[PDB]
Symmetry: C6
Subunit: 175 residues, 6 copies
């Protein structure tokens, strides 16, 4: 199983990167080459937020970006009905203001409430870059990107079905 | 055998979910093709309740839903004799009010007291849907249901005897 | 050999039950077909009581029922010599008052004191059943008994000598 | 060879017995058959007392009896030189008094101090028996004894060197 | 091939040394004989700082000394862009002072802040010796250095890529 | 080949003695045969002290005795440069006063401090013995000494490099 070994060793690589509590993680994806995405995506985001963005010491939420012509509004509605709230980065819905998408949330401890658990954007509309470079960048099926830099960890994969990523990221045991 | 193998992987598949103290779990069962049902059901429920609805942080109790012409009146008395109080939803005798079958119970810590430990209804009398969606829906031997949804996890199975499921859900440790 | 594997398989079926501090356990035993019973009975009881009936959380004590025409007085005197106390259920006469044999003891947390550790009786002289049915009903070398029911867990064995049981109930580490 | 595995088997039959903090243990030994008794006796008693009689929770110290013709004065002196104190049972004369030997010691917690850490005698001198019977009796290279009873956990071995016994008593790691 | 074993052994030799919280560690590196160094150095240094210089019990920051004609001005800026502060020993002028480099930093516990995390230098510019001979010295592709002494725990390696050393120093999980 | 097992056997034999905190240990050494002694002696002593004489619960420091024509002064100066302090038993004069070498040090808990960490002396000079006998006596490359007695654990080895002992005594992880 040459391919299965790829996933197993890749899972063993990324261990220390995800042990930390506070880190700036960023994801990019392309959905035209992932089978059964529209049905499989919300379960994924809820599982990730439940493991790595559902406590106090988890200061910085993740950023999911997408490529293509995908329609985000419907996904925002579905995630809201699921139970989560997102920072779109918009004021009026015209176009993204960078400064808001990359801001710090309000955190209370007793009782724990978190202003938002995730960030959601599209890649084209996000024109520019942040002030503090990302610690990790996860490129799921995208060849090139503009945030690649020498001093940023970078990972690049090709997955056919999302479950594989759920295994790489300690969310389901069986491949 | 073949079935001996699959159940191990399925037992391992659900270890993450059941660790969460708070969750909404829903069970749908069919007793026509389950051998030796009328004898084992009470013990199954008793073990489940002691495992996952016996403490404080176990907030939301589960929902066992049966399909067919079963008789609940006898089961509720057998259970009261065993020591468990149940929530059917009836106020008057005839029909089920969806709002009362999904309410939150009173919880006293010191000394620990529960208003109830389980909720039980027949599937046909429960005409409607819930305000919030279930997290996990176990469909033991039922082909299709109305509450299937993309954003809701679904595990569908076939089992010969109720002893087969106690292994899957960590109530026994052989087979 | 193969018979040992039987005992090993049993040792596991019974693990979770004994992990519970409080539970109503019952024993029915037949001495006619056990080897060297009168030589080992007291060692067996003393071990069981030390492991499962010597702490405050262990509120419900066990019952040992012996079938056959046997002499309890001598065993009781031996047990008093051994340091234990018992609850025969009798008040100065032959008859066995049932309400007095299934009562709760007095417990003082600091310092540890216990009114009685074990319950002892003879099956012929018990006419009736407890209001709260037993969680476990072991049946060592007896075929059928009256307290068998659908919602009572039953475990029926055959044993050549008592050293075989101690291994099943986690008193002696090896076979 | 095969004998060593027998020793390894005996080693784990005794693990529960010795885990207890308060227990009365007794030993009988026959020097004539053991090689290098005089050379290793003190080392053995010192290890045993370092592990099993060197704390407050360790209430009842052990009892070492030796049969045959042998001198206890030399051993008592060598032990005093080693650092340990012993209870002979004498009140100045040439006769023993059982109450004095089987008495309880003074125990202070802070700073921990023990009136005596062991008991020593010759079997021929001790004419009688104890009020409470031993929980464990270890016969070393002796067949019979008056204190054997159906309600005592008698253990019997045959040894050639004292290094073999230490392994059974969880002191030396290797054989 | 066979090369894996050597590194696996080194990884185990150096475990006790890297457990200690406070210790004076020194590093020498020659870049001419390493592939893709400019790209890796920064991630290497950051991964090292996180594990061994990101607490209050981590007293002495480590020292990195390069060999050759390398340009420090660029690296010292890249590290600031990454989020780190360094001590060079320079006071305005081109000359290097021994006292200011081997200096203890201000550490405030609650809240946690550190004057500096790392020390950087070019070998040839550093003339003299320290006050306390180092506890460990690491030679990476260097044959001889003056500080080699008979009371210093030297370790000499030979590497092809920096990812190897991260394995040796416990930074990454697998080769 | 076989030597690997001899040393691992010894390593496993002495695991119990060293777990203890307070204890009297003596070493006798004969450098005429050991290869590369002057080079590794100080690293040995520092490693040994860091683990067995660096806490407050470690009351008795160890004693290192060396045989033959050898000059201690230089080693004492070297251990001073390293960061340690030794007790030689000399009140000015060359003669060795025994009552001042086996004394108890001053120990403050918070803040920690040790008056001295190790003892060091030549064997020919020490004329006498201790008031209280030593628990363990490690003889390396020496036949017989005057402190051997039946009530002491007299270990004897034969080694040619000093790392061997570092493995036996648990300072180095792997042979």
């Amino acid at each position: 199983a040459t391919k299965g070994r790829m996933f197993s060793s890749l899972r063993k690589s990324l261990r220390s990167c995800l042990a930390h509590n506070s880190r700036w993680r960023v994801f990019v994806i392309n959905p035209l080459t992932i089978e059964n995405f529209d049905d499989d995506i919300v379960r994924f985001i809820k599982a990730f937020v439940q493991r790595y963005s559902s406590k106090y010491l988890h200061s910085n939420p993740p950023l999911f970006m997408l490529t293509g012509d995908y329609d985000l509004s419907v996904l925002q509605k579905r995630l809201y009905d699921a139970g989560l709230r997102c920072e779109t980065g918009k004021v009026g819905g015209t176009d993204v203001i960078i400064k808001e998408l990359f801001r710090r949330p309000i955190l209370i401890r007793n009782p724990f409430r978190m202003e938002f658990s995730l960030r959601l954007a599209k890649r084209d509309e996000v024109i520019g870059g942040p002030q503090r470079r990302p610690d990790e960048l996860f490129l799921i099926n995208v060849a090139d990107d503009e945030w690649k830099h020498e001093d940023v960890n970078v990972h690049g994969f090709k997955i056919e079905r999302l479950s594989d990523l759920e295994y790489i990221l300690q969310l389901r045991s069986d491949y």
